[PDB]
Amino acid sequence: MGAIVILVVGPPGSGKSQLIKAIEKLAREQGQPVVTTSVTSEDEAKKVLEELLKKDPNAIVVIEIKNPRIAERVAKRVLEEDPTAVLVVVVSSPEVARELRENLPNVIVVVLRDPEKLKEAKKQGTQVLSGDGNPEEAAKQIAQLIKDQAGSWS
Ligand SMILES: [N+]
């Protein structure tokens, strides 16, 4: 099918590790292998992606990003390394999400509050899903969105 790459973007305290735990658990239940990596710089991402996303592995790769400022370059690096990867960016801030949407043609999702900033994000194509603070629902919602817009997830 191809690689599904999920960037999970947000500062410490955004729910990333719990969201990632829920995504891994649901994926195991569906018989799909998931691997995770946490990156702090664009080259770290290059290093791990150039090793891992070698031959469009049929796998889910989750990338944890604690520094939202690097998200865009890491997203671009993913596409550079594997132009045949599905890329889903789960972002904590609606403002970051809007900025990433403007700079990429990639699925960008917010589960997370300010109604005005959220509307602005959605206007640039940010997708909103229920399950902020409920990792299990969130994981379910993300998997449904990937199925409907990207493929089986198998
Ligand atoms: N919200």
Numbering used by the authors: -1 to 110, 112 to 153
From the paper:
Here, we attempted to design an ATPase de novo, through the exploration of an optimal backbone blueprint to incorporate a conserved phosphate binding motif, the P‐loop, into designed structures. Many naturally occurring ATPases (Saraste et al., 1990; Walker et al., 1982) possess the P‐loop motif, with a sequence pattern of GX1X2X3X4GK[T/S] (X indicates any kind of amino acid residues). The P‐loop motifs in naturally occurring proteins typically show a cradle‐like conformation to grasp the phosphate moieties of the ATP molecule. The designed protein, based on the identified blueprint, was found to be a monomer with high thermal stability and exhibited ATPase ability.
The crystal structure of one of these designs, PL2x4_2, was determined and found to be nearly identical to the design model, both in overall structure and in the P‐loop motif. As a result, the blueprint with a 14‐residue helix, a loop with the AGBB ABEGO torsion pattern, and a six‐residue β‐strand was identified as the most optimal for allowing the Lys residue to point inward to the P‐loop cradle, facilitating the interaction with the β‐phosphate moiety. The P‐loop motif binds the phosphate group of the ATP molecule, while the adenine moiety is enclosed by a loop structure leading to the last helix. In this design, PL2x4_2, the adenine ring forms a hydrophobic interaction with Pro134 and two hydrogen bonds with Arg112 and Gln116. Arg112 is further stabilized by two hydrogen bonds with Gly11 in the P‐loop motif and Asp131. The de novo designed protein with the ideal P‐loop motif demonstrated ADP binding and ATP hydrolysis abilities as expected. However, these abilities are lower than those of typical naturally occurring ATPases. The simulations suggested that the low binding and hydrolysis activities might be due to a suboptimal binding pocket for the adenine and ribose moieties of ATP, as these moieties were detached from the binding pocket during the simulations. Furthermore, we found that the loop (the C‐terminal loop connected the sixth strand) adjacent to the binding pocket exhibited unsteady dynamic motion. Consistent with the simulations, each monomer in our crystal structure revealed different loop conformations, suggesting that the loop's flexibility might indeed contribute to the suboptimal binding pocket.
